[PDB]
Design a protein around this ligand. Structure first.
Ligand SMILES: CCCCCCCCCCCCCCCCCC(=O)OC[C@H](COP(=O)([O-])OCC(O)COP(=O)([O-])OC[C@@H](COC(=O)CCCCCCCCCCCCCCCCC)OC(=O)CCCCCCCCCCCCCCCCC)OC(=O)CCCCCCCCCCCCCCCCC
Ligand SMILES: CCCCCCCCCCCCCCCCCC(=O)OC[C@H](COP(=O)([O-])OCC(O)COP(=O)([O-])OC[C@@H](COC(=O)CCCCCCCCCCCCCCCCC)OC(=O)CCCCCCCCCCCCCCCCC)OC(=O)CCCCCCCCCCCCCCCCC
Ligand SMILES: CCCCCCCCCCCCCCCCCC(=O)OC[C@H](COP(=O)(O)OCCN)OC(=O)CCCCCCCCCCCCCCCCC
Ligand SMILES: Nc1ncnc2c1ncn2[C@@H]1O[C@H](COP(=O)(O)OP(=O)(O)O)[C@@H](O)[C@H]1O
Lengths: 42, 120, 344, 47, 96, 318, 98, 51, 459
C-alpha cells in the first residue's frame, strides 16, 4: 500500500537511556527532558 | 615538516617569494568551484531560513559567491606556494645529497628475464 | 549573567587556549590550561540543575589532577635540564606523563569516562565549547612536543579511543552523549598521526570542528537531546533534514563527502610510515561509528517517526532561524572534497 | 497581510548596501590583485 | 638529591590519594592541595640550588593559580552539600 | 531584543509601574469572568487577553484568520461535551491544545508586560488549567497516564514563567453555573454533567486557590462582589504586591525571561516532547499530510515577509 | 490508536482520460510525455543510433586485419617465407642468460 | 522564451563539454609529431598534424 | 568524456528548475539524447584505448557499460513515474536527481583511469542507492535491507582502500594505464596472498559471490523498481569491472589463489539457481537468478582466459538488460496485483496479451536460447571453464538444466494457467509499461545482431 512509515512500537525502542538494554542497565530510566531531576524535598 | 625551514616567516600568510609563482587564473576550475560551493551555501541558507530559495537575498547570493571566490584566489595563491616550496626543498636535497638518490640505469627487456606464469 | 561577568569569563575561556598556543615557556602553557579549567566551570553550571553540579564537579576534578600531573612534568624537566621546556634529552617517563595527562584533559581512551558524562549534563551550547574550543589547547601542547613523544603509547590511546568511542556510541540514544562519544573517536585519529605528521592532526581537527559545530547548532535549533526528539525534525524544520543527513555520514568516513579526507590522508601517512597493522584495525572499527550515525539517519530522515499534535502549534509560530554559520559550515564541511589537495 | 507584521517587512537598506557594496569592493580588489600580480610575476621572472 | 625523591613520592602518594576517593569530597580537595605543596616545594628547592633566581617567580605563580583553582573546587563542594546535604561522592551519580 | 538592546537601556526595570502586573481571573465554566476581565482591563488600561482558544494560536500567527480544525490540532470542545470518554480522545487532545494555547497566551502576555510595561489580565492561565484535567480524571474523561503526560508538560514548561501577581477569583455554586448555562443556550455546553463542574471548582477551591495563595495575591469574590467590576478593581488597587517570586526579578534577570517569551518556538518546546501517548500522536502519514497542507496556506509557505501570495514584496533583496 | 490516515485507494486512471498513456493524470501532459518519449526514445536513438553504430568503420581494426593478412599471406607465400614464423620477437634481439 | 530557457541548460552542457574537451587536447599537445609511429614532416601549409 | 558527464550534471539543474508538471518529460527526453552522445565513444577505428584526458578514459570494457549506464537513466525514470507519482513535487525531484547522480557517478566510475578514483566514486554510488532503497522502499524491512547493502559493501571497501594505497607506495601511481605497462608481479608470499584477497574481496562482495550474496536478495526485494533495475543492471557489474582492471596487477597469485572462489561460485551457481526453483516472491527469484548468472561471471574473471573475459563482458551487458526487463515486468504485476507472491496472478496472458510476449522473450533471454548474446556469453564461459577442468561441465551443466526450469516456471505460473478469479480487477497495460519493456528488449535484439561491440578487452 503505502511505504511503511514507522509505527509507535518501532519508535518505542529508541526510548530508554540505553539502546541495547543490559541486565541491570535496563533498570535505569530515561533522563528527565527538562534536564532537572524531580529529586527530593531535601 | 616544512616549518623550521630557513627564512620561515614566523606568522606571515604568503611570503613575497610567492610572487615569483604564477598567479592563479581567476577562472581556475577550483576558484570556480569555490564559487559554486558558495552559491550553494547561499541557496542553502535561504532554504533553512524558509525563504524563496533562489529569488531571495539576491544581494546575499552575491556576497556568498563573491566571498568564497575572494577567499579562494588568496588561499590558492598560498597553497600553490606551499607546494612550490616543497619542490624547491625536495629537488634541492636530491642534489645536495646526490649519492643517496643515484640515477640508476635499468636494462632493456631483451636482457631482463621476466618470469612467465602460464595461464593455461 | 551580569554581562560584565560574561565578558570576563568568556575572555578567560578564550585567553586560556590562546596563551597556551602562543607561549613557549611551558609554564605559561600550563597556566593557559589552568585558565581554561577555571573559565569553563562557571558556564557549565548556568542552569544550576542537580545534574549540572555533578557535571562540573567531575569535569573539575578530572581537569585539576591532570593539570597537576602536567605541572609535575614541567617541574621534573626543570631539574633534568635547567630549561623550562621539553627537549631531545628529556627522560622518556617525563614525556609519557605529559601524554597521559594531556590525554585526560582531552579525554582520550582509558580516560574517556568523564567526557561522556559532562557532555550529558551541560547545555548543548556549552557542550560545543567543551568539546571543540577546549581541545585546541591541549592538542597545541602535544603538537608542539610531537617530535619527542612515544609512538607506542599514542597508538594505543589512539586505537583504544577509536574502539571505546565507537562501542560506546552504539548503545547511546542521548544525542549529547553520542557526540561525546564521537569526539572521543575522532580525537583518537588525531592523536594517531601526531607522532608522524602533526600537520594532519590540525586537519583532522578543523574538519571535526567544521563538522561538529554545524551538527550541534542543528541539535539545538530544535534543542533535541534525544534521537526521538531529532526524529520529529521533519515536522519542526524540514530543510535541515537533508544536511543533517550528510553531515552525520560526513562525520563517519564515507567517500564522496569531506569527512573521508581526514581518515584517507591519516591512513596514507600511516602506511607511508608502515603502520599497516594499526591503520587497518582503526579504519575497520571506524566503520562501526557510521553504523550508529546511520541508525540516527534512519530515525531523523530516511524514515518519518510519528509526531505529536502539539507540534502543529510550534510549526505555526515562526521558527527562530539558524545562524548563518550553520550554512557556511555545513557546506564547507559536507562537500569540499573536490578541493582536498589544497587542504592538506 | 500579517497580524503580527513580519519584522522583515522590507529589506534592511543598510544590509543591502554593505552586502552589495562590500562585494563590489571585493572584486575591484581581487581583479586588481590578479593583473597587478601577473605583472610582478612576469617581471620578477624574466617575463 | 634524595630530598627530591621523597618530595616526588609525596606527590605520587598524594596522586594515589586523589585517584582513590573515600566518600569525602573535602578530603580530596585537601589531597589535591597536598600535591601543589609538593610541587611548590620541589620547584622552590631546585630553583634555590641552581641559584636560578630568574625562575623564582614560578614557585609563586604556581601557588597563586593553585589557590584560585582550589577556590573554584570548594565552591563546587559547597554547591554539592547545598544540593545533597553532604559532600559524599556517591551522591554524584546522576549522570550515569 | 537581545543583550545588545538590554545592554543599552531597554530594561524592563525602567518600564514597570504600579498598574503593571499579571492578573488572572479564574472561575467555573461560566463565572462571568469574561465580563469582570474586560472591566478590570478598562480600569487600568490593562491589555485584556481573551481566554485561550483552539485557533487562538492561528489568530496569533500570520493572517490571523481562523485555521481549519485539523490544522489547529483537530480539537472540539463541542465534541468534548457530546462525546465524553471518546474512543479517539478528542477531550485530551482538546485539553493539551488548550494548555499550549494559554502557554502561547501567557508568554505573549509576559512579552507585552516586559516590553510595553503595561499590565495584563489573562483570565484563566496555565496555572488554572489543571482543574479541568483533575475533574476529567475524576470522571471517566481521561485515564491516569493521560494525566501524567499533562503533568509532565506542566512541570517542564510552567516553572520557567513568573507566577501571576494576583489571581482574582469568582465563585458561583454549581447550581448557579448550570443555570447560567441555560441562559446562553448551546446544545454542547449545555450537556455538562454537574459532577464534572463540581470537580472543576473543587480543584480551584482546594488545589488552585490555596496553592497560589502563598505564591500570589489571592482575591476571591462572590458572584455579588462580581458584576461590580468597580469594587473588584478597587480591591486589586488595594492589595499590596509583596509576597511572591516576582520580588527578585532584577533587570538582568528579566532580560533572559523576555528573550524566552520573545521566542515562541521555545515557549512550547517542551509541549512537543516526544512522549508517545496515543491521543497526542499525529502519526507520520496523517501528520505529513496536515503539514504539507498547513505549510501551503498563503503567507505560510515562507517566513513572514517573504511569501508573495499575501502581497509581500522586496523578497529579492530581503 | 494513534491518528493516521485511512488507506488511500488507487484510482482507475483509465476511468477518466480513457486515452491514458500511463505517464500523468491530466491528458495533455500524458500525450506530450509520450509524443516526446516514443520519439526521442525510439525514433532518434534506436534508429539514428543504430545507423551511426552500424557505420562505425573497421571497429577495433578487424576490417584492416583481413587485408593486412591477405598482403602478408600474399607476400609471405610468394617469397617462400613461413606464413606465421614460429618466434615473433627475433631470437637475435633476445639476450639469453648463461 | 516563456520559461522554456530550461531547455538550453542541458544542450549548453554539451557545448561546454566539448569546449572543455578541446582544452584538454590543447594541454596534452606534446608528441604532436614526435610519435614514432606517426612522426612525419609537416606537409606544405600545415602547422599542426593534429589539432 | 565530459559530454556524457557534463550534460548529465546539467540534468540536475533541469529536474529542479523545471515545472512540476513538465519535470518528467524534460528529464527523460534529454537523457535519451544524453545516451545518443554516449554512443560516440563506440567509434573506435583502432585498437588504442581512447584516453580522453588524464583522469577520464574509455576502453573496450568500459564503453559497453557507460552506454548502458546512460541508457537506463531514461528507462529508470520511466519505470518510476507511476509509484513516485503520488509524491509532493519535491520528493519526485529528489528521486529523479538521485537516479541522475547514479549514472553521473557510475559513468565516471566505469570511465575512470585512477583505481582510487574508482574507489571514491565506486563507494559513493551506495549513497544514492541506499536513499532510493530506504527512503522510498515499500516494505517494513528496507531499513534492514539498507543496513545489509551498506555494511557488506563497506567492510569489503576499507580493505581495498588499504590495498590500493599500498600498491601506490609499492609501484608509485594507481594509474591503470601505467600499472598495466609496469612490472607488478606479486611474490606468492603469505602477505601477498592477503593483498590479492583484499583487492578482489570488495569487488567480489557487490558481485554477489555464493558466500556473501544475502545482501542482494534482501536489497532488491524491498527496493523500488528503479533501485532494483540499477542494482541488477549497473551496480552489481561495478564489481565485475573492478575485477577486470585490478587483476592486471596481482598477476601471479590468482593462478592458485582463485580455486576457493571458483568452486564457491560454481557450486554457488547450482544452489542459487535451484532455490529460484521454489521461491514464492517473484522479485526474490529474479534476484537469485541474478546471483547465479553473476556467479558464472566471477568464474570467468578468475579463470582469466581470453574467452572467459569477453564471455563475461557479453553476459554482463546482456544479463544486465535482461534482468532489468524481468524486474521491470515483475513491478508491473506488483502494482496491479499489490503483492509480490508468484502463486497469485495466474493466467495473465489471458488478460494482458502483449506483456506476456515481453515476459516470454525476457525468459528466453534469461535461459540460453541461441541467437541471443546471453547464450554466446554462457557458451564461452562454459568453454573456458571446461578448459580449466573438463569436469566443470557437470556443475555448469546442472545450472543450465535448472536455469531452464525456473525461467519457464516464472512464465508458466505467472503468465499461463487459469486466470485468477477476481483479484482487484487488473487495469489494462499502460503504454509506458510496454515501452519501458520494448526499450529494454529492442536493444537486446540489436546488440545480438553485432556482438563485437560488447566483446571485451580480450577480443
Ligand atoms: C559551474 C558550471 C561551469 C561554470 C563556468 C564558469 C566560467 C569558467 O571559468 O569556465 C571556463 C573554465 C575553463 O577551465 P580550463 O582552464 O579550460 O580547465 C580545463 C581543465 O582540463 C579542467 O580542469 P581540471 O579538471 O584539471 O581542474 C582541476 C580540479 C578542479 O576541481 C573541481 O572542480 C572538482 C569538481 C568536483 C565536482 O579538478 C579536480 O579536482 C579533479 C578531481 C575532481 C573530482 C573530485 C571529487 C568529485 C566528487 C566530489 C563530490 C562533492 C559533492 C558531494 C555532495 C554529496 O572552466 C572551469 O574551469 C570550470 C568548469 C566547472 C568546474 C566545476 C565547477 C563546480
Ligand atoms: C555521492 C553524491 C550523492 C548525492 C545525492 C545523495 C546525497 C544528497 C542527498 C540529499 C537528500 C537526502 C535525504 C534528505 C531528506 C529527503 C526528504 C525530505 O525531508 O526533504 C524535504 C525537503 C523540503 O525542502 P523544500 O522546502 O521543498 O525546499 C525546496 C528545495 O530547495 C527545492 O527548491 P526548488 O526546486 O523550488 O528551487 C530550484 C533550485 C533548487 O535548489 C536546491 O534545492 C539546491 C540544493 C543543493 C543541495 C546540494 C546537496 C549536495 O534549483 C537549483 O538547484 C538552482 C538552479 C539554478 C542555479 C544553478 C547553478 C549552477 C549549477 C551548475 C550545475 C551544478 C551541478 C554540476 C556542477 C557544476 C558543473 C561542473 O526537500 C528538499 O528540498 C531537499 C533539498 C536538497 C536536495 C538535494 C538534491 C541533491 C541532488 C544531487
Ligand atoms: C573482509 C573483506 C576482506 C578483508 C581482507 C583483509 C586482509 C588483511 C588486510 C590487508 C592485507 C594486505 O593489505 O596485504 C599486504 C599487507 C602488507 O604486507 P607487506 O608487503 O609485508 O608490507 C610490508 C612492506 N615493508 O599486509 C597486511 O596488511 C596484513 C594486515 C593483517 C591484519 C590487518 C588487520 C585485520 C583486521 C580484521
Ligand atoms: N480544559 C477545558 N476543557 C473543556 N472545555 C474548556 C476547558 N477550558 C475552557 N473550556 C471552555 O471554555 C468555556 C468558557 O465558558 P464561556 O461562557 O464561553 O466563558 P466564561 O468561562 O468566561 O463564562 C466553557 O464552555 C468550556 O467548554
Amino acid at each position: 500500500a503505502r511505504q511503511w512509515q514507522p509505527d509507535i512500537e518501532w519508535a518505542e525502542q529508541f526510548s530508554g537511556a540505553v539502546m541495547y538494554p543490559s541486565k541491570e542497565t535496563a533498570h535505569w530510566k530515561p533522563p528527565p527532558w527538562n534536564d532537572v531531576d524531580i529529586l527530593k524535598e531535601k | 615538516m616544512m616549518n623550521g625551514r630557513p627564512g620561515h616567516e614566523p606568522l606571515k600568510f604568503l611570503p613575497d617569494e610567492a610572487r615569483s609563482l604564477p598567479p592563479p587564473k581567476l577562472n581556475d576550475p577550483r576558484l570556480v568551484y569555490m564559487g559554486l560551493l558558495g552559491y550553494c551555501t547561499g541557496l542553502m541558507d535561504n532554504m533553512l531560513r524558509m525563504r524563496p530559495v533562489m529569488r531571495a537575498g539576491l544581494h546575499r547570493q552575491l556576497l556568498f559567491v563573491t566571498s568564497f571566490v575572494f577567499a579562494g584566489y588568496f588561499y590558492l595563491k598560498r597553497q600553490n606556494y606551499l607546494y612550490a616550496v616543497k619542490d624547491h626543498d625536495m629537488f634541492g636535497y636530491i642534489k645536495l645529497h646526490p649519492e643517496d638518490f643515484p640515477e640508476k640505469e635499468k636494462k632493456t627487456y631483451a636482457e631482463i628475464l621476466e618470469p612467465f606464469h602460464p595461464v593455461r | 549573567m551580569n554581562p560584565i561577568t560574561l565578558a570576563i569569563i568568556y575572555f578567560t575561556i578564550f585567553l586560556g587556549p590562546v596563551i597556551t598556543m602562543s607561549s613557549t615557556n611551558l609554564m605559561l602553557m600550563w597556566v593557559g590550561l589552568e585558565f581554561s579549567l577555571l573559565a569553563i566551570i562557571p558556564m557549565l553550571i548556568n542552569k544550576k540543575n542537580p545534574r549540572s553540579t555533578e557535571a562540573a564537579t567531575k569535569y573539575f576534578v578530572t581537569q585539576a589532577t591532570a593539570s597537576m600531573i602536567i605541572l609535575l612534568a614541567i617541574v621534573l624537566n626543570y631539574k633534568q635540564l635547567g630549561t623550562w621546556m621539553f627537549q631531545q634529552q628529556t627522560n622518556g617517563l617525563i614525556l609519557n606523563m605529559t601524554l597521559m595527562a594531556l590525554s585526560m584533559k582531552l579525554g582520550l581512551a582509558p580516560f574517556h569516562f568523564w567526557l561522556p558524562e559532562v557532555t550529558q549534563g551541560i547545555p548543548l551550547h556549552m557542550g560545543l565549547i567543551l568539546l571543540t574550543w577546549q581541545k585546541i589547547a591541549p592538542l597545541s601542547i602535544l603538537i608542539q612536543i610531537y617530535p619527542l613523544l612515544n609512538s607506542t603509547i599514542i597508538l594505543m590511546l589512539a586505537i583504544t579511543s577509536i574502539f571505546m568511542g565507537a562501542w560506546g556510541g552504539l548503545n547511546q540514544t542521548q544525542m549529547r552523549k553520542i557526540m561525546a562519544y564521537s569526539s572521543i573517536a575522532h580525537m583518537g585519529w588525531m592523536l594517531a598521526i601526531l607522532p608522524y605528521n602533526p600537520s594532519l592532526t590540525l586537519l583532522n581537527l578543523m574538519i571535526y570542528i567544521i563538522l561538529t559545530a554545524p551538527m550541534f547548532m542543528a541539535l539545538m535549533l530544535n534543542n533535541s537531546m534525544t534521537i526521538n526528539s531529532i526524529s520529529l525534525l521533519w515536522n519542526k524544520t524540514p530543510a535541515m533534514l537533508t544536511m543533517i543527513s550528510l553531515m552525520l555520514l560526513s562525520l563517519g568516513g564515507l567517500p564522496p563527502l569531506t569527512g573521508f579526507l581526514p581518515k584517507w590522508i591519516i591512513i596514507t601517512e600511516l602506511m607511508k610510515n608502515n603502520c599497516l597493522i594499526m591503520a587497518t584495525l582503526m579504519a575497520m572499527m571506524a566503520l562501526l561509528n557510521l553504523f550508529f550515525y546511520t541508525r540516527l539517519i534512519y530515525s531523523t530522515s530516511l524514515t518519518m517517526f510519528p509526531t505529536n499534535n502539539n507540534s502543529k502549534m510550534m510549526t505555526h509560530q515562526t521558527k527562530t532561524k539558524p545562524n548563518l554559520m550553520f550554512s557556511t559550515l555545513a557546506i564547507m564541511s559536507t562537500m569540499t572534497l573536490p578541493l582536498a589537495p589544497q587542504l592538506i | 497581510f500579517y497580524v503580527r507584521e513580519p519584522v522583515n517587512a522590507k529589506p534592511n537598506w543598510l544590509a543591502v548596501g554593505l552586502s552589495v557594496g562590500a562585494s563590489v569592493f571585493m572584486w575591484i580588489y581581487l581583479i586588481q590583485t590578479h593583473n597587478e600580480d601577473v605583472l610582478e610575476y612576469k617581471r620578477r621572472n624574466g617575463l | 638529591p634524595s630530598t627530591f625523591f621523597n618530595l616526588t613520592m609525596a606527590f605520587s602518594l598524594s596522586l594515589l590519594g586523589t585517584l582513590m576517593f573515600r566518600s569525602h569530597l573535602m578530603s580530596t580537595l585537601l589531597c589535591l592541595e597536598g600535591m601543589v605543596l609538593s610541587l611548590f616545594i620541589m620547584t622552590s628547592v631546585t630553583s634555590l640550588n641552581s641559584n636560578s633566581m630568574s625562575s623564582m617567580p614560578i614557585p609563586i605563580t604556581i601557588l597563586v593559580f593553585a589557590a584560585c583553582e582550589a577556590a573554584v573546587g570548594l565552591a563546587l563542594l559547597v554547591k554539592v552539600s547545598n544540593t545533597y546535604g553532604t559532600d559524599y561522592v556517591q551522591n554524584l551519580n546522576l549522570l550515569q | 531584543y537581545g543583550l545588545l538592546a538590554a545592554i543599552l537601556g531597554d530594561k524592563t526595570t525602567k518600564k514597570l509601574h504600579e498598574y503593571s502586573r499579571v492578573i488572572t481571573v479564574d472561575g467555573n465554566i461560566c463565572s462571568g469572568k469574561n465580563k469582570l476581565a474586560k472591566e478590570i482591563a478598562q480600569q487600568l488600561g490593562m491589555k485584556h487577553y481573551p481566554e485561550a482558544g483552539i485557533q487562538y494560536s492561528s489568530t496569533t500567527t500570520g493572517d490571523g484568520r481562523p485555521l481549519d480544525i485539523e490544522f489547529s490540532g483537530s480539537c472540539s470542545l463541542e465534541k468534548f461535551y457530546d462525546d465524553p470518554k471518546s474512543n479517539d480522545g478528542n477531550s485530551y487532545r482538546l485539553q493539551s491544545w488548550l494548555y499550549a494555547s494559554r502557554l502561547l497566551q501567557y508568554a505573549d502576555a509576559l512579552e507585552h508586560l516586559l516590553s510595553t510595561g503595561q499590565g495584563v489580565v489573562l483570565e484563566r492561565s496555565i496555572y488554572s488549567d489543571f482543574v479541568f484535567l483533575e475533574a476529567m480524571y475524576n470522571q471517566g474523561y481521561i485515564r491516569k497516564q493521560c494525566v501524567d503526560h499533562y503533568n509532565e508538560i506542566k512541570r517542564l514548561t510552567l516553572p520557567e514563567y513568573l507566577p501571576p501577581h494576583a489571581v482574582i477569583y469568582i465563585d458561583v455554586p454549581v447550581p448557579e453555573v448550570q443555570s447560567r448555562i441555560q441562559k446562553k443556550g448551546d446544545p454542547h455546553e449545555m450537556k455538562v454533567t454537574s459532577a464534572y463542574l463540581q470537580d472543576i471548582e473543587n480543584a480551584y477551591k482546594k488545589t488552585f486557590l490555596p496553592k497560589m495563595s502563598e505564591m500570589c495575591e489571592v482575591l476571591v469574590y462572590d458572584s455579588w462582589e462580581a458584576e461590580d467590576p468597580t469594587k473588584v478593581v478597587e480591591d486589586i488597587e488595594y492589595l499590596k504586591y509583596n509576597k511572591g517570586p516576582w520580588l527578585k526579578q532584577d533587570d538582568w534577570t528579566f532580560h533572559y525571561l523576555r528573550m524566552l517569551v520573545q521566542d515562541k518556538t521555545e515557549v512550547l518546546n517542551y509541549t512537543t516532547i516526544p512522549v508517545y501517548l496515543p491521543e497526542i500522536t499525529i502519526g507520520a502519514h496523517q501528520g505529513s499530510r496536515i503539514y504539507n497542507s498547513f505549510r501551503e496556506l498563503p503567507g505560510r509557505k515562507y517566513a513572514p515577509g517573504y511569501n508573495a501570495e499575501v502581497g509581500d514584496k522586496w523578497i529579492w533583496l530581503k | 490508536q494513534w491518528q493516521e490516515d485511512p488507506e488511500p485507494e488507487d484510482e482507475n486512471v483509465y476511468a477518466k482520460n480513457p486515452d491514458f498513456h500511463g505517464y500523468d493524470s491530466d491528458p495533455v501532459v500524458d500525450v506530450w510525455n509520450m509524443r516526446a518519449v516514443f520519439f526521442f526514445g525510439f525514433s532518434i536513438v534506436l534508429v539514428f543510433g543504430t545507423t551511426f553504430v552500424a557505420y562505425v568503420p573497421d571497429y577495433r581494426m578487424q576490417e584492416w586485419a583481413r587485408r593486412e593478412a591477405e598482403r602478408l599471406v600474399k607476400y609471405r607465400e610468394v617469397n617462400g617465407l613461413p606464413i606465421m614464423e614460429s618466434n615473433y620477437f627475433d631470437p637475435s634481439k633476445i639476450q639469453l642468460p648463461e | 522564451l516563456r520559461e522554456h530557457w530550461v531547455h538550453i541548460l542541458v544542450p549548453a552542457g554539451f557545448v561546454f563539454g566539448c569546449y572543455l574537451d578541446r582544452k584538454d587536447d590543447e594541454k596534452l599537445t606534446a608528441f604532436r609529431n614526435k610519435s614514432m609511429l606517426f612522426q612525419r614532416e609537416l606537409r606544405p601549409n600545415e602547422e599542426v598534424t593534429w589539432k | 568524456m565530459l559530454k556524457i558527464i557534463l550534460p548529465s550534471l546539467m540534468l540536475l539543474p533541469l529536474t529542479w528548475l523545471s515545472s512540476p508538471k513538465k519535470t518528467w518529460t524534460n528529464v527523460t527526453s534529454y537523457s535519451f539524447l544524453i545516451s545518443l552522445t554516449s554512443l560516440t565513444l563506440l567509434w573506435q577505428t583502432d585498437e588504442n584505448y581512447k584516453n580522453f584526458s588524464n583522469m577520464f578514459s574509455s576502453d573496450p570494457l568500459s564503453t559497453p557499460l557507460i552506454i548502458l549506464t546512460a541508457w537506463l537513466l531514461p528507462l529508470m525514470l520511466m519505470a518510476s513515474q507511476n509509484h513516485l507519482k503520488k509524491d509532493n513535487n519535491v520528493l519526485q525531484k529528489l528521486y529523479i536527481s538521485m537516479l541522475i547522480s547514479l549514472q553521473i557517478l557510475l559513468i565516471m566510475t566505469f570511465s575512470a583511469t585512477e583505481l582510487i578514483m574508482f574507489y571514491i566514486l565506486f563507494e559513493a554510488t551506495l549513497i544514492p542507492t541506499l536513499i532510493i532503497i530506504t527512503r522510498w522502499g515499500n516494505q517494513t524491512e528496507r531499513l534492514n535491507a539498507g543496513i545489509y547493502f551498506l555494511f557488506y559493501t563497506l567492510i569489503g571497501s576499507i580493505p581495498l582502500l588499504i590495498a590500493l594505497i599500498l600498491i601506490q607506495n609499492h609501484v608509485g601511481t594507481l594509474n591503470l594505464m601505467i600499472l598495466s605497462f609496469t612490472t607488478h608481479t606479486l611474490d606468492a608470499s603469505w602477505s601477498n596472498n592477503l593483498l590479492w584477497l583484499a583487492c578482489m574481496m570488495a569487488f567480489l562482495i557487490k558481485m554477489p559471490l555464493y558466500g556473501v550474496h544475502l545482501w542482494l536478495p534482501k536489497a532488491h526485494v524491498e527496493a523500488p523498481i528503479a533501485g532494483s533495475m540499477i542494482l541488477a543492471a549497473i551496480l552489481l557489474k561495478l564489481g565485475s569491472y573492478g575485477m577486470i582492471r585490478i587483476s592486471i596487477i596481482l598477476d601471479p597469485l590468482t593462478k592458485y589463489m582463485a580455486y576457493p572462489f571458483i568452486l564457491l561460485s560454481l557450486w554457488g551457481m547450482i544452489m542459487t539457481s535451484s532455490i529460484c526453483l521454489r521461491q514464492t516472491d517473484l522479485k526474490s527469484l529474479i534476484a537469485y537468478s541474478s546471483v547465479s548468472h553473476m556467479a558464472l561471471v566471477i568464474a570467468s574473471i578468475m579463470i582469466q582466459t581470453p574467452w572467459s573475459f569477453m564471455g563475461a563482458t557479453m553476459l554482463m551487458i546482456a544479463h544486465g538488460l535482461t534482468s532489468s526487463l524481468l524486474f521491470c515486468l515483475a513491478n508491473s504485476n506488483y502494482e496491479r496485483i499489490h503483492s509480490r507472491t508468484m502463486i497469485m496472478a495466474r493466467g495473465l496472458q489471458m488478460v494482458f496479451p502483449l506483456m506476456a510476449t515481453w515476459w516470454l522473450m525476457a525468459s528466453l533471454a534469461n535461459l540460453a536460447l541461441p541467437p541471443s548474446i546471453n547464450l554466446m556469453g554462457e557458451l564461452f564461459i562454459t568453454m573456458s571453464l571446461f578448459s580449466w577442468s573438463n569436469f566443470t561441465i557437470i556443475l555448469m551443466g546442472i545450472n543450465i538444466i535448472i536455469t531452464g526450469m525456473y525461467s519457464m516456471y516464472m512464465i508458466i505460473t505467472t503468465q499461463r494457467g487459469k486466470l485468477t478469479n477476481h483479484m482487484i480487477n487488473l487495469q489494462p497495460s499502460h503504454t509506458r509499461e510496454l515501452t519501458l519493456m520494448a526499450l529494454h528488449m529492442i536493444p537486446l535484439i540489436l546488440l545480438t545482431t553485432s556482438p563485437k561491440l560488447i566483446t571485451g578487452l580480450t577480443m
